[PDB]
Amino acid sequence: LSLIKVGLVGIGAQMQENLLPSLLQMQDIRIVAACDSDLERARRVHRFISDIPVLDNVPAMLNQVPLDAVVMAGPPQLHFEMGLLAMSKGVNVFVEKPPCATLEELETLIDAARRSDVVSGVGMNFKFARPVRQLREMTQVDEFGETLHIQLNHYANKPRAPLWGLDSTLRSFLLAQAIHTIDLAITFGDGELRRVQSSVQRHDDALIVRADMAFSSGATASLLAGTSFPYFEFDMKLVSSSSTLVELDNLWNITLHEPEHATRPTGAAKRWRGAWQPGPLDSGYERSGYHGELHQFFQAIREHRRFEADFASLLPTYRVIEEICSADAVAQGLQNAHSRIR
Amino acid sequence: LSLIKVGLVGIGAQMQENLLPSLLQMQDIRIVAACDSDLERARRVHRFISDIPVLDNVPAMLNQVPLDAVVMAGPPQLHFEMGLLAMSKGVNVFVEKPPCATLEELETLIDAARRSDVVSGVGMNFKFARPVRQLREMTQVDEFGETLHIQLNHYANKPRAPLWGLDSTLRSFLLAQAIHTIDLAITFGDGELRRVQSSVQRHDDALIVRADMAFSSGATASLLAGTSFPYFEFDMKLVSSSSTLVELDNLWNITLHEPEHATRPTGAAKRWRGAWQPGPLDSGYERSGYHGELHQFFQAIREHRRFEADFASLLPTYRVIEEICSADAVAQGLQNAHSRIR
Amino acid sequence: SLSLIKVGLVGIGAQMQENLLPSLLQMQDIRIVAACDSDLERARRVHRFISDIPVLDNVPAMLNQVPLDAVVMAGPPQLHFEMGLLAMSKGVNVFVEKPPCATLEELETLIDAARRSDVVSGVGMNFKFARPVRQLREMTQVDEFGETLHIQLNHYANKPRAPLWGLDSTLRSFLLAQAIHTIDLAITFGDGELRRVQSSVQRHDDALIVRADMAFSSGATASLLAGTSFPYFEFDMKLVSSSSTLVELDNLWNITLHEPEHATRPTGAKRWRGAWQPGPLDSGYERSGYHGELHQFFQAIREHRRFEADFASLLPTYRVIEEICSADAVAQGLQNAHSRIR
Amino acid sequence: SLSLIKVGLVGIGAQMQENLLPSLLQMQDIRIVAACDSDLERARRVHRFISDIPVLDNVPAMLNQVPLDAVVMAGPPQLHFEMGLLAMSKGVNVFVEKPPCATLEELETLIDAARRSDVVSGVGMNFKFARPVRQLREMTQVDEFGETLHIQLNHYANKPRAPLWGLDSTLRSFLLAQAIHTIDLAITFGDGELRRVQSSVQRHDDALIVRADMAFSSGATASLLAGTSFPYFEFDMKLVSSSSTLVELDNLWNITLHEPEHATRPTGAKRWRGAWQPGPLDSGYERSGYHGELHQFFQAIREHRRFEADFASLLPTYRVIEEICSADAVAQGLQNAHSRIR
Ligand SMILES: NC(=O)c1ccc[n+]([C@@H]2O[C@H](COP(=O)([O-])OP(=O)(O)OC[C@H]3O[C@@H](n4cnc5c(N)ncnc54)[C@H](O)[C@@H]3O)[C@@H](O)[C@H]2O)c1
């Protein structure tokens, strides 16, 4: 296969922990430049690949190094600005979430993606996580019937203050975290988003966000998310029209509840379920989705088709984010005037 | 202690499986009559206690046998009609849920309870279940802070048709099942019910009900319930203002997530939680709540105080049931006219 | 219908009050007609449930004054042994909590007395009658399970850490108070005569850890880990069969069953397994075995058949127990002899 | 900064491609400079990641033509043994997958060669370096844990069910392919010299079940259950300490830690325990041990120190392995001799 030539931007924590390692073990791709404002961070790639250029700004990299793609892991502002620059030069663009800070910015990125006709992508790794893929495959099987209801629980401890210079801690949380689980909702909903209701509770610097979504397919989704928890954890469920209930705990173990489940020593006795977890030595970046999201991005480049987590795919997710922030602004407003008056 | 004299009504399945066994091992109470339309069912109590009267109708029992209390496990219609009769005779009344079929009937029972000044009770065993009690005790402890959010998941497979001659399968499900988990919501909400939103999805003869509740205390509750599942199961969670998350799975095991949990061999290392489950030989009727609900009912009689699950305590639960049925009737109506027209 | 079996209770302490008595109280067609205890106030506790029945402070007096068909005892083995012989000579059926006696030779006297008297004798070997143990035993008798090759038993406790009932040995006390249960489970699943036993004990302060391996003529092997070197009582076990089936039972609660080629309808595959646990409202005394051990004991009386946990049934377990104590004393004798040699 | 360590790969089959190679590719400051395989097309698979580097179909040729500091092998023990001696005589550091050889006597030749050549030698004993095993080992070195009294190891597999690498024995093949890992864990936690070993093997068709017990001079005992009589590879282990602490590690994933007087802030008590598992996005090769085994091997090269899984470190495990095969052949010799006597 022809080698895909990749330039890296923002060699910080998520680049070093997850993306770079995935790229390093990724077939038929070559990393040919690294860029970071702090050039010493860029040179971290020399620990793996000697000699390749390190640059302190993206424009220099785009001008000196021939590239089929850039993979970026920085702030929304980086992804937005340089994202547009890279696309304007005909380079395919993969960025960590969030791709940008606003719906209107996303619409700008979408429009540029279409005009430049390049493959775009966002690092929505939950979508590509092996156990999530397995669940998605279940929804395609006849005996599962239809997905009626999706429940998502997404715990985190931060952010407890605004990020990237945004005024709002809620908007920061939605873009830093909930973006993942809202997108999972849109993914399993499978059909057009038809209604969104939501609410936000605050306590000190902590948040609990509840969002409910209905889809044209008839399916509903409910998300509990926030920063009022000790650490990042994630659990989801699916309820199907054939009375199948599927639970995925921590992207690790699956529990499958269905009428008339059996084992051979017992036959179909009341209350048997199926359970599944990985083997003890499960490793790499598939279970977590980093491998999958990059692999498919590159594939979409090879066959010049759409990448499933391109900018446009995020359109419904940004609408939900916007709606969650608008409703909260109204709620806050009313409560503030209430008090001001009483 | 003086012996409390108890008459039983409706010696069917739930009486034989749970209540009668709890009464039989209950200190200082005496069963002194059994009543059932099918006298052979009433005589099932002769398997345990010889000679005591068996009657085929409640009025006969109230006229011939001196009683401090009746415990009933039949249809709502039995509980309502004979409930009022027993109270009119100055007898304390314990009935299985549902105590009746409508808000207006509950209001009638409440008013009679107050006029007769007797102890009333409903067999809301989830409230009294040992693990639920443990959770409630946690909410009373300073380091827990306040309960911000309560999540309840209540799976069942039935009813898939209307019960007790009601027109509505939804109302049957709400009274047969969800009554338990809605009441748990009101219990942990602790404060006045301030808003209720809800939705009902149908598929064939199966239902998925989603209800959200907000309390004056600031706390919110979300319930997922229905008959679109293989068997009865129940999971709940609490999110507290101190970033404590508490999970109770199947009234069996508890998981307690909190900042800086430790073990002695490790110190407070990232991602340690507390877990708790009963010992292997856990038995009787405490874990499940049947013991507790009856014990406290009898106690309320001894000290002539209120029983915590008396008729009045169910007032907010019936309001939610009514609201869920009203909203569904509107939704159905609109969808029916939509089609009729298109 | 059925005739009432008349039962006297001896030893109204903790195990009588927590499990046995409650079980008896809900048992069809038996009457508790007398309670006997050294401490007449303990005997009187029955009056919380059943008025007027005679209380005695010694077994001889109860046997003279009250017509009885069976006694049920929960005291020390000295009481089980002596009063159990006395009740049997008067043609009374005898049920005793473990342990029935302190020594193998005692057990042999018991066995002999019970054969000559032609009464039903029984020991409260409740693990053996526990509903999930029954489910495990049932799989074992099914062709596709194949043969049971290996049985792993893990029995944890925190006591006794001092000798019991005036015995000299903390090891003998532990084996008689705790391990007896799991040694007997091993015999029960081994199914075949005991061919070989190896054991060892490790001591640390007042705590111990016993390991014992058993081989059976059926080819099956068993391995047991038990001691007091733990925080609390817990129990897990495993079965390995010749169809490559592994069955795990954790705390008499959940069952995991691993077998080649397990499936779900939505996935058709590797690493799928079966899981089972009771419903949330599981209650009474079946799961723990107290109900079944008693119910079978009474059935055996009515049908004049052998009760499966009679004194004889315990012979192999007391053999194992002797062999562990002998071996240990030799290991101890050596270590001490090695030391006064240094 | 650091000098680049130059690595040749030998044996580009499944374990090289799934774990070792990906680990090497993300390893700071090492360069893969050659790949060697009988099947040049397998060798060429490296070119999916690193262009142009020489491919050879034999180790001798690679050692002549390419300057190397270390080789990393993943082939049969015959290859590890012979080519491992060859690489060591040329002053090349040698890392090989298990097993490093087929026999104890081979291992001794390896140990001797490695001492004379003064190079770092190593075996891919990855369980030992697995992050959760490290956590367990760390608790063990902490005063309050007390001493480790007992170690229980359960190692399940479905293969091999036929002899491997032209060996005659399916038992030797299994011990060398699988149990080697868990025998070595036992040695590692036993901490003290091996005092005693007992074992037994049971056969059923083409499957086996090995039990082995080990005692150590530190007082610690170990008990291991391993075989092929199971659906799939799984692994769980337990530590019992003298502070009455029990630690369980299930499938290198979750840790349960039982200790007297555990607590939560909201409950202050009996039956509380600690639990731990990784976050949902846990990835790479640390958890499984491939990362750490390699990283330490390279660190040992740089510091010219001993690598903890060198050939010598494996001596006790190969001793155990011989003793299990000897014992088994005697047990077999007897059963057959008993039979031609019948
Ligand atoms: N999908 C996942 O699971 C998840 C996990 C972690 C973070 N993320 C995302 O990854 C991204 C990066 O976060 P991080 O935690 O590694 O933070 P970081 O501060 O450690 O890394 C960001 C890097 O970008 C660089 N950068 C900033 N602007 C630049 C510019 N104009 N040109 C070149 N370099 C520039 C920084 O100097 C830095 O080294 C985010 O958008 C974040 O939300 C994804």
Ligand SMILES: NC(=O)c1ccc[n+]([C@@H]2O[C@H](COP(=O)([O-])OP(=O)(O)OC[C@H]3O[C@@H](n4cnc5c(N)ncnc54)[C@H](O)[C@@H]3O)[C@@H](O)[C@H]2O)c1
């Ligand atoms: N709380 C729990 O967990 C839960 C579990 C099971 C059922 N319940 C409740 O228990 C109650 C009884 O249900 P059941 O399942 O045992 O059904 P059932 O049909 O088996 O028992 C009802 C009994 O009441 C009798 N009855 C009816 N009307 C009577 C009358 N006018 N006078 C005397 N007897 C009369 C019947 O003949 C019968 O034997 C309900 O209201 C039900 O919803 C509670």
Ligand SMILES: NC(=O)c1ccc[n+]([C@@H]2O[C@H](COP(=O)([O-])OP(=O)(O)OC[C@H]3O[C@@H](n4cnc5c(N)ncnc54)[C@H](O)[C@@H]3O)[C@@H](O)[C@H]2O)c1
């Ligand atoms: N493992 C289990 O299945 C379960 C658990 C605990 C106890 N056991 C068994 O039950 C028995 C009692 O245990 P416990 O924990 O309830 O202790 P306990 O405090 O209940 O003592 C039992 C009773 O027997 C009485 N007694 C002693 N000698 C008597 C005599 N000569 N005549 C009449 N009464 C006499 C005592 O006064 C006392 O009230 C034991 O043998 C024990 O191992 C069963």
Ligand SMILES: NC(=O)c1ccc[n+]([C@@H]2O[C@H](COP(=O)([O-])OP(=O)(O)OC[C@H]3O[C@@H](n4cnc5c(N)ncnc54)[C@H](O)[C@@H]3O)[C@@H](O)[C@H]2O)c1
């Ligand atoms: N348990 C674990 O930690 C993990 C798991 C599986 C395998 N292992 C070990 O890794 C090794 C290989 O296992 P595999 O499953 O990857 O099988 P495999 O299909 O990968 O075979 C390994 C490779 O070595 C090559 N080879 C054989 N002899 C050679 C020679 N003389 N010169 C050059 N190349 C030669 C083969 O052609 C082949 O491509 C074993 O010794 C095994 O036990 C590690």
